[PDB]
Amino acid sequence: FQCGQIIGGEFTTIENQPWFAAIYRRHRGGSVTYVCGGSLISPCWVISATHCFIDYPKKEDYIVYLGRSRLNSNTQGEMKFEVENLILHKDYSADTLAHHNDIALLKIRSKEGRCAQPSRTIQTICLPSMYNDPQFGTSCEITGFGKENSTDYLYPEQLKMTVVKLISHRECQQPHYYGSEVTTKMLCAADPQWKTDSCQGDSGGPLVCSLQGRMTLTGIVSWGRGCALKDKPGVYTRVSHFLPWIRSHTK
Ligand SMILES: NC[C@H]1CC[C@@H](C(=O)O)CC1
């Protein structure tokens, strides 16, 4: 492994986002449904958002897939996993509109007792170095099985991706935007003409940026008001500010 090597946007294959994890819940009735996204950060660890699991925190109930480009069908080279350990951030909160410390860790273990193995469809995403983010106005990529329009009932069957641009705290903390709801441990991103964005079901997925030739996990899909609404960008967990929390649990 060599690390880092939807409204609008386009369809894609997992070769373009080989770090993408598709997380599913098995329920209480035997039926399995899509919960949300995630990113492979090391062979045994997938990173996502706490809000994806806060209502069902029993590890035994989740299924993780790597190398999956299709929602309810099989893709050649996909690897299935059990969640060995589900770590939610104890300081998670969502009392108001914003979700605070919205980050989660999933230890993955296949029925064959193995962790993720590199292939053309399974790869790791580079974690940022402490506090090192791309410049405001940088184009980064988002990926998911989320809705194509907020009013849609169904989820697309094929994986999607688009490009969004990082927005400064100054701009995002404006009152017609999110105001004081966005903290410094969050990152805002949007399409300049509000035509593309992450939507419902893209939660936990990554905001992938290129820094020093490395695709970096700069954000994790967290929250926002609607999808692709003027002045209402997608808000992301600012990974570069959660490194001791990640390290503390992957040691
Ligand atoms: N645009 C980002 C935002 C992330 C998920 C959210 C939700 O699941 O409610 C809707 C949109």
Cα 160 from chain centre: 13
Closest CA to 21 of 104, 144, 120: 144
Q: For this structure, is 51 an active site residue? A: yes
3-state secondary structure of 61: helix
Beta bridge partner(s), residue 45:
42, 107
Q: Are 18 and 123 in contact (CB under 8 A)?
A: yes
**Ligand 1 pocket member 227 (CB < 6 A):** yes
Closest CA to 107 of 55, 20, 4, 38: 38
Experimental method: X-ray
Beta bridge partner(s), residue 141:
163, 208
Distance CA 13, CA 68 (A): 8
Resolution of the experimental model, in Å, one decimal = 2.3
Q: Rounded to the nearest whole angstrom, what is the distance from the C-alpha of residue 251 to the centroid of ligand 1?
A: 31
Indicate the CATH number for domain 18-124+241-250: 2.40.10.10
**From residue 237, how far is each of 29, 31, 68, 73, 95 by CA, in Å?**
32, 30, 24, 30, 16
By alpha-carbon position, which residue is closest to atom 7 of ligand 1? 200
Cα 97 from chain centre: 19
**Ligand 1 pocket member 53 (CB < 6 A):** no
Distance CA 28, CA 211 (A): 43
Q: Are 7 and 197 in contact (CB under 8 A)?
A: yes
Residue among 145, 197, 199, 237 to mutate when testing ligand 1 (max atoms within 8 A of CB)? 199
Where along the chain do its domains lie? 6-17+125-240, 18-124+241-250
**Ligand 1 pocket member 199 (CB < 6 A):** yes
**From residue 225, how far is each of 139, 178, 185, 198 by CA, in Å?**
21, 9, 18, 11
Other CB atoms within a 10 A radius of the CB of residue 162 amount to 21
Q: Rounded to the nearest whole angstrom, what is the distance from the C-alpha of residue 199 to the centroid of ligand 1?
A: 5
**Ligand 1 pocket member 221 (CB < 6 A):** yes
Q: How far apart are the first and last CA of the chain?
A: 19
Q: Rounded to the nearest whole angstrom, what is the distance from the C-alpha of residue 145 to the centroid of ligand 1?
A: 12
Q: Tell me, what amino acid is at 67?
A: G
Q: Are 77 and 119 in contact (CB under 8 A)?
A: yes
Distance CA 102, CA 237 (A): 6
Q: Kindly name the residue from 39, 100, 102, 241 that is annotated as catalytic.
A: 102
By alpha-carbon position, which residue is closest to atom 2 of ligand 1? 234
> ∠ CA 229-93-185 to the nearest 5 degrees?
70
Q: For this structure, is 102 an active site residue? A: yes
Q: Kindly name the residue from 39, 42, 48, 51 that is annotated as catalytic.
A: 51
